[PDB]
């Protein structure tokens, strides 16, 4: 009957054509819309410029006079936004990040643009979305749509797969060392997938690391300081885009005793006619629980004097005048005496 | 120009340089790789020639951009070499331990894993056998290149025995019976205090972590309270997850795996 | 009415002729006017001298006596005005200057001369016009008019091309020094137009600059003092009417360590019959973060004493009477042992 009120509540949908980069307006009415000023064949209006108002007369054969005109504006921008995966590599196993990046400037204001995200059974309203505590090795899909003036015109689906993580953990059966420099470490391989078994060994001060193959389970460490405590941490590590190390199994052992090194700072001084004072510093490597110094005095490759003291301070007396004696001082930790240090010294004479 | 080369693990990847030899191959970081035919920085396994470069046994440390320059330096060839890891492999479990019962006064032969020599250890942490040579003669046992023979089995010969090959890839596990410190997993609520009990009251306690830095040392990145017997964690955060091993000078230690809820 | 009243508000237009350098005056009237003495056919009067008062009589058949008396002041010559480009060479990249000069003076006063300039959308009224904030590599168009007592009599126009300038900015890929004397610096050419590069290296004492071709991308500094820090500043420059160098890129690096040279004035003096005093000055080239001195005392081409002191001050006691001794003292930087300094001296004593 009357066209004034029939199309008052009409709906207009705007579509963006990339080949012409133009806007097409479509009326959500089954019946035909006919116009005389502009070409409005079927129910679509073409050749519309963004951010510009246009006047179109709307009439139908079923409804008689009076006629009416409608004013239309076109603010929707479709393709200058691209969906990007902003997932952090260090936490890519359980965190999924989705962001929108703009590549071409548009005249539309941001106050009338909204973003909607449907990720499986989750709904979000934000330009950039974050998901935390997601089960690894699950390939999910999520849709993101851009709405202008509460209408759907741009939508994009993206599929994201999580990465590997959390390997281990090795079970160290036992670590020990029955030799001065040789230690034996025995473990078992973890059930979960890993790559190459990073193992580190640390002494009191120094520390070192290395990697082992995924097959061997028994390892031997050489060139170890005798009577020195060592702590070993082994963790099965996998190589993703970021290397995932996993929990580490730790063990400790002390190496067996061994003969020490030479005594240090062998100082000999002359005080009287046949009295010499010999003192020295403890060796750098004790290699033993106890402390003891043995000094032997010889003449002509013949042992004639032998003394022992817990401290390196020995007095030599009752010797012939002007005689080249030999002093050999060595360290006896209790089990294996060290190699001696030998010096030659002459005496003084009788007034 | 700029190219991307992926390749696989343990692949001798060849990078082609610009003409007008000799050429120099550097990296963006500043590590010298190739100077003409002569090789520089041997710690990285690679070989050089007058024009090209070759990388041998590539891995994660090779994931970078290599720049090759000609003699005059007027041209550049940039190659972004990345490494894609192979799919993870599941390690096959070792053979399950088996039980053997030995009567008094009998000699028992136990078969080692294939591949001489066979190394035999016990549960208490001693080196029973290393090949033909036999250690700890007090236990009265013998060992050839393949088996281990217990002679005049004791009442104390009961225990676990482990046999390994030269490379240690395989293992056999026996439990011999004479017939007539587990790690603790602790879950801690974030922002709370956690108490860990160390060794006995006889001796100073030293603590270590997976990061290999002593927690009790000053200027530590995480708050802590160390005493001679116990360890206290105050306001536990997410970074506290890991493993902590505490041991004294008397060869006694305990491992606690701390996980934050 | 009378001719004086009818033609009281008559207007005159002046046209300049360069061939005769003369001004022709035309009355802005439609009807033909005749003059008594001077011929004034139609409405134009020719042969008028510049800056001279001209008296003319205007009358018509429709107006009676008195005749209109008109006084005309001829503007000066057009060719006497010259347009000059006052743009400075140092600021030619972002500034354009235009000026009007009067090389030949005229009897007309200079108080009633107006110069109106228009560049793009900017219109000003001044003898000299200067414009700033100009994008490089562009051509601009200006026009100007010269008016005699607010009456237009000269017009001109010009086009000015903006000179190229302000290149850069180059980005340095890396800088390093992996050798004792060789350092490698690699950069990237700038996007804007450029001709060559200038690289300046500064140390604790001297600063020296060098020029490089645009083709070169890498440079290898040689003949450098070991274990010294240099700061390198690189900037691309273009040879315009004046040289233009843009923002530079700065980096810093230090070389490696090399063995130090021999010590200086290793004085050796006698102290007693079995002791010697040894001193020396530190070497000029430390070439290391640590200072240490090592001395070796030998007798008969056989090492018998080894000492290490923080300073070159050594006492050689408990020697043998009447025998030679060789002292080899060198400076150690903690990374490489330098060339030892060797001297020989005889312990010329007798008990
Ligand atoms: C049963 O096995 C044990 C070894 O586990 C053997 O008997 C006893 O072994 C212990 C541990 O070595 C001996 O104690 C120590 O032995 C030596 C001197 O023999 C020395 O290191 C110490 O002074 C300490 O005594 C113990 O003496 C030894 N006892 C006997 C009677 O041999 C034993 O051989 C095995 N067989 C039987 C049938 O018991
Ligand atoms: C955006 O939404 C449209 C529908 O509005 C999707 O187009 C459909 O895509 C499916 C597969 O996902 C096809 O089977 C259908 O034939 C498509 N058309 C219709 C009318 O359903 C489109 O996939 C979505 N995503 C993108 C990136 O355009
Ligand atoms: C890549 O080439 C190298 C060099 O030939 C191979 O690695 C080893 O290199 C050493 C030192 O030159 C040689 O003595 C060895 O013979 C090489 N190993 C082998 C197994 O030949 C490396 O194997 C080559 N990689 C591939 C995949 O062929
Ligand atoms: C780079 O490798 C060359 C050998 O290819 C090394 O020896 C130089 O060789 C060039 C010719 O290739 C000679 O002109 C030089 O005299 C050689 N010695 C030098 C430069 O010290 C050279 O040492 C290597 N390193 C550098 C920095 O060039
Ligand atoms: C990774 O490949 C490198 C190629 O050089 C192997 O060699 C070691 O690389 C590290 C890291 O740069 C150096 O510190 C070592 O000196 C290199 N040599 C040795 C003998 O370790 C390295 O082993 C490889 N890593 C693996 C397979 O885990
Ligand atoms: C370095 O690589 C270049 C470029 O590939 C090699 O030059 C030619 O390489 C092609 C590759 O198909 C060969 O068929 C030609 O025989 C090569 N020509 C020559 C003259 O060698 C070049 O051989 C490689 N090696 C060196 C040392 O320059
Ligand atoms: C277990 O082995 C031991 C060691 O070889 C055997 O004892 C020896 O037996 C031989 C004869 O086979 C005698 O000649 C030796 O005198 C025995 N040695 C000792 C120290 O007594 C023992 O017989 C074996 N036991 C069994 C049950 O076969
Ligand atoms: C681990 O290292 C071994 C020994 O070099 C090698 O064979 C294997 O391929 C490595 N594994 C991975 C996943 O790279
Ligand atoms: C794992 O090991 C790598 C390689 O040594 C190291 O860089 C990294 O800090 C370790 N830890 C983690 C959590 O990745
Ligand atoms: C030297 O004397 C000590 C006691 O002072 C004694 O224990 C030692 O056996 C003697 N002999 C040697 C060679 O040390
Ligand atoms: C490396 O892989 C990437 C994946 O995007 C591919 O584009 C590139 O061509 C590959 N380079 C090769 C195979 O050399
Ligand atoms: C930059 O150019 C100016 C002239 O415009 C010149 O005086 C100056 O030395 C140049 N700076 C350099 C070469 O570092």
Q: DSSP secondary structure string, A97-115?
A: EEEEEE-S--SS-GGGEEE
- The H or E element that residue A235 is part of is strand A229-235
Neighbours of chain B (3+ CB pairs under 8 A): A, C
Find out whether C183 and C221 touch, Cβ atoms under 8 Å.
Answer: yes
Is ligand 9 within 6 A of the CB of residue A243? yes
Torsional sign, CA A38, A42, A48, A51: positive
Closest residue by Cα to residue B250 from B181, B194, B185: B181
Distance from residue B50's CA to the centre of ligand 6 (Å) = 10
- What does the alpha-carbon distance between residue A168 and residue A248 come to, in Å, rounded to a whole number? 8
Beta strands B253-260 and B184-188, pairing class: parallel
Domain C268-346 has CATH 3.40.50.280: no
Say how far apart CA A83 and CA A158 lie, in whole Å.
Answer: 8
User: Domain tally for chain B?
Assistant: 3
The reported resolution of this PDB entry, expressed in Å, is 3.8
User: Which ranges of chain A would DSSP assign to H, the alpha helix?
Assistant: 3-6
The method recorded for this entry reads cryo-EM
Q: In angstroms, rounded to a whole number, what is the distance separating the alpha carbons of residues B175 and B156? A: 13
CB atoms within 10 A of CB C210: 11
Would the CATH topology of C81-161 be identical to that of C171-254? yes
**Contact at CB, B72 and C175, closer than 8 angstroms:** no
φ and ψ at residue A250, rounded to 5 degrees: -120, 145
Same domain, B108 and B173: yes
Count the neighbouring beta carbons within 10 Å of the beta carbon of residue A206: 9
**Which residues, at least 6 apart from B195, have a Cβ–Cβ distance to it below 8 Å?**
B230, B231, B232, B233
List CB contacts of A197: < 8 A, sequence separation 6 or more.
Answer: A170, A211, A212, A213, A214, A234, A235, A236, A237
Tell me how far apart the terminal alpha carbons of chain B are, to the nearest angstrom: 50
User: ω into residue A247 within 30 of 0, thus cis?
Assistant: no
Closest chain C residue to B32, measured at CA? C178
**Phi, psi dihedrals of residue C56, rounded to the nearest 5°:** -130, 155
- C-alpha to C-alpha distance for B160 and B171, rounded to whole angstroms: 13
How far is the C-alpha of C257 from the C-alpha of C228, rounded, in Å?
A: 9
Asked if residue B92 belongs to a domain, the reply is no
Residues B166, B115: Cα–Cα separation, whole Å: 7
Residues 6+ apart with CB under 8 A from B152: B105, B107, B140
**Gap from CA of B138 to ligand 1 centroid (Å):** 6
**φ and ψ at B138, to 5 degrees?**
-65, -25
Ligand 7 centre to CA of B108 (Å) is 12
Q: Where are the domains of chain A?
A: 3-72, 81-161, 171-254, 264-346
User: How many CB atoms within 10 Å of residue B82?
Assistant: 15
CA distance B79 to B64: 8
Cα separation, B99 vs B110, in Å, equals 11
User: Is the CB of residue C290 less than 8 Å away from at least one CB of chain B?
Assistant: no
Whole-Å CA distances, A74 to A68, A81, A108, A144: 20, 18, 9, 22
Residue among B95, B96, B112, B122 nearest B176 (CA): B122
CB B112 within 8 A of CB B127: no
Q: Is the dihedral of CA A187, A191, A197, A201 positive or negative?
A: negative
Q: Are strands C249-254 and C229-239 parallel, antiparallel or unpaired?
A: antiparallel
Cβ proximity of C198 and C276 under 8 Å: no
Ligand 8 atom nearest the C-alpha of A211 is 2
Binding site membership of B11 for ligand 11 (Cβ less than 6 Å): no
Q: Is residue B89 domain-resident?
A: no
Three-state secondary structure of chain C? CEHHHHCCCCCEEEEEECCCCEEEEEECCCCCCCCCCCCCCCCEEEEECCCCEEEEEECCCCCECCCEEEEEECCCCCCCEEEEECCCCCCCCCCEEEEEEECCCCCCCCCCEEEEEEECCEEEECCEEEECCCCCCCEEEEEEEEEECCCEEEEEEEEEECCCCCCCCCEEEEEECCCCCCEEEEEECCCCCCCEEEEEEECCCCEEEEEEECCCCEEEECCCCCCCEEEEEEEEEEECCCEEECCCEEEEEECCCCCCCCCECCCEEECCCCCEEEECECCCCCCCCCCEEEEEEECCCCEEEEEEECCCEEEECCCCCCCEEEEEEEEECCCCECCCEEEEEECCCCC
Number of neighbours of residue B254 by Cβ within 10 angstroms: 19
List % helix, strand, coil for chain A (3-state, nearest 5): 5, 45, 50
Taking CA atoms, C346 is separated from B200, C298, C324, C326, C343, in Å, by 66, 12, 4, 9, 10
Tell me the helix, strand and coil percentages in chain B, rounded to 5. 5, 45, 55
Q: What are phi and psi of C163, to 5 degrees?
A: -70, 145
Q: CA torsion angle for C174, C177, C179, C185 (degrees, to 10)?
A: 50
Boundary (domain end) residue, out of B81, B110, B142: B81
Which residue among A211, A213, A238 is best mutated to probe the pocket of ligand 8, counting the most ligand atoms within 8 A of its Cβ?
A: A213
C184 lines ligand 4 (CB under 6 A): no
- Domain-ending residue, one of B81, B116, B133: B81
DSSP state of A92: T
Is B250 a member of any domain? yes
Q: Tell whether C186 lies on the interface with B, counting CB pairs under 8 A.
A: yes
Pick the CATH number of C171-254 from 3.40.462.20, 3.40.50.150, 2.60.40.60, 2.60.40.10: 2.60.40.10
- Structure-block tokens of residue C7: 């033609």
Question: 């010499």: which residue's tokens?
Answer: A276
CB C234 within 8 A of CB C248: yes
Q: Which residues of B touch A218 (CB under 8 A)?
A: 119, 164, 168, 171
- The CATH classification number of C81-161 equals 2.60.40.10
Q: Give every CB contact of residue A295 below 8 A, 6+ residues apart in sequence.
A: A278, A306, A307, A308, A309, A314, A327, A328, A329
Residues of chain B in contact with residue C186, where contact means CB-CB under 8 angstroms, are 26, 67, 69
∠ Cα B83 B84 B87 (to 5°): 145
Instruction: Name which of A93, A90, A98 is nearest A124 in CA terms.
Output: A98
Give the whole-angstrom CA distance, residue C147 versus residue C156: 12
Quote the tokens at residue C293.
């001195």
From B30, B41, B75, residue closest to C174, measured CB to CB: B30
**Domain span including residue B28:** 2-81
CATH code of residue B220: 2.60.40.10
Handedness of CA A239, A244, A249, A251 (dihedral sign): positive
Q: For B175, list phi and psi in degrees, rounded to 5.
A: -125, 110
User: In chain B, whose CA is at the least distance from the CA of C216?
Assistant: B74
Q: Is the dihedral of CA A145, A147, A150, A151 positive or negative?
A: negative
Which CATH code is given to the segment(s) A264-346? 2.60.40.10
Residue A35's alpha-carbon distances to A47, A57, A69, C93, in angstroms, are 15, 6, 10, 57
| 3-class SS of residue B137 | helix
A317 alpha carbon – ligand 10 mean position (Å): 18
Cis peptide before A143 (omega within 30 of 0): no
């Amino acid at each position: 009957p009357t066209c004034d009120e029939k199309y008052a509540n009409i709906t207009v949908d705007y579509l963006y054509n990339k080949e012409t980069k133009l806007f097409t307006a479509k009326l959500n009415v089954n019946e035909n819309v006919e116009c005389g000023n502009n070409t409005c064949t079927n129910n679509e209006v073409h050749n519309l410029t963004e951010c510009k108002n246009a006047s179109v007369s709307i009439s139908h054969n079923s409804c008689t006079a009076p006629d009416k005109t409608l004013i239309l504006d076109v603010p929707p921008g479709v393709e200058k936004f691209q969906l990007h995966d902003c997932t952090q590599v260090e936490k890519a196993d359980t965190t999924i990040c989705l962001k929108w990046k703009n590549i071409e400037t548009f005249t539309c204001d941001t106050q009338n643009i909204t973003y909607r995200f449907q990720c499986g059974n989750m709904i979000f309203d934000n330009k950039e979305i974050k998901l935390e505590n997601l089960e690894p090795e699950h390939e999910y899909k999520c849709d993101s749509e851009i709405l202008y003036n509460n209408h759907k015109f741009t939508n994009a689906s993206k599929i994201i797969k999580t990465d590997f993580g959390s390997p281990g953990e090795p079970q160290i059966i036992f670590c020990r060392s029955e030799a001065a420099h040789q230690g034996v470490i025995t473990w078992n391989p973890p059930q979960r997938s890993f790559h190459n078994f990073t193992l580190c060994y640390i002494k009191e001060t120094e520390k070192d690391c290395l990697n082992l193959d995924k097959n061997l389970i028994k390892y031997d460490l050489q060139n170890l300081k005798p009577y020195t405590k060592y702590v070993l941490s082994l963790h099965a590590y996998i190589i993703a885009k970021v290397q995932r190390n996993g929990s580490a199994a730790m063990c400790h052992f002390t190496t067996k005793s061994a003969p020490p090194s030479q005594v240090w700072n062998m100082t000999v001084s002359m005080t009287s006619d046949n009295s010499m004072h010999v003192k020295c510093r403890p060796p750098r490597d004790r290699n033993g629980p106890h402390e003891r110094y043995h000094l032997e005095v010889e003449a002509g490759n013949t042992l004639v004097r032998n003394e022992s003291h817990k401290n390196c301070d020995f007095r030599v007396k009752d010797l012939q005048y002007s005689t080249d004696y030999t002093f050999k001082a060595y360290f006896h930790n209790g089990d294996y005496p060290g190699e001696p240090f030998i010096l030659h010294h002459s005496t003084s004479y009788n007034s | 120009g700029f190219h991307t080369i992926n390749a696989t693990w343990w692949a001798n990847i060849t990078l082609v340089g610009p003409p007008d030899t000799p050429v120099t191959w550097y990296d963006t970081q500043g590590l010298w790789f190739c100077n003409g035919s002569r090789v520089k920085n041997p710690q990285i396994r690679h070989t050089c020639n007058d024009q090209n470069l070759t990388l041998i046994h590539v891995n994660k440390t090779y994931e970078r951009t290599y720049m090759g320059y000609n003699r005059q330096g007027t041209k550049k060839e940039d190659y972004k070499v990345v490494v894609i890891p192979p799919p993870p492999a599941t390690v096959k479990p070792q053979p399950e331990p088996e039980y053997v019962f030995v009567y008094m006064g009998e000699n028992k032969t136990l078969e080692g894993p294939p591949g001489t020599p066979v190394t035999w250890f016990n549960q208490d942490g001693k080196k029973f056998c290393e090949g033909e040579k036999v250690l700890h003669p007090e236990f009265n046992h013998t060992c050839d290149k393949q088996n281990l023979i217990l002679l005049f089995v004791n009442f104390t010969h009961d225990g676990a025995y482990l046999g390994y090959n030269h490379q240690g890839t395989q293992r056999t596990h026996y439990e011999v019976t004479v017939l007539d410190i587990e790690a603790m997993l602790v879950t801690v609520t974030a922002g709370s205090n956690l108490t860990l009990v160390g060794p006995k009251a006889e001796g100073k306690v030293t603590w270590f972590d997976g990061d290999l830095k002593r927690p009790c040392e000053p200027n530590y990145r995480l708050r802590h309270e160390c005493n001679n017997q116990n360890l206290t964690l105050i306001n536990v955060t997410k970074d506290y997850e890991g493993t902590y091993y505490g041991t004294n000078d008397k060869d006694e230690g305990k491992r606690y795996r701390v996980k934050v809820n």
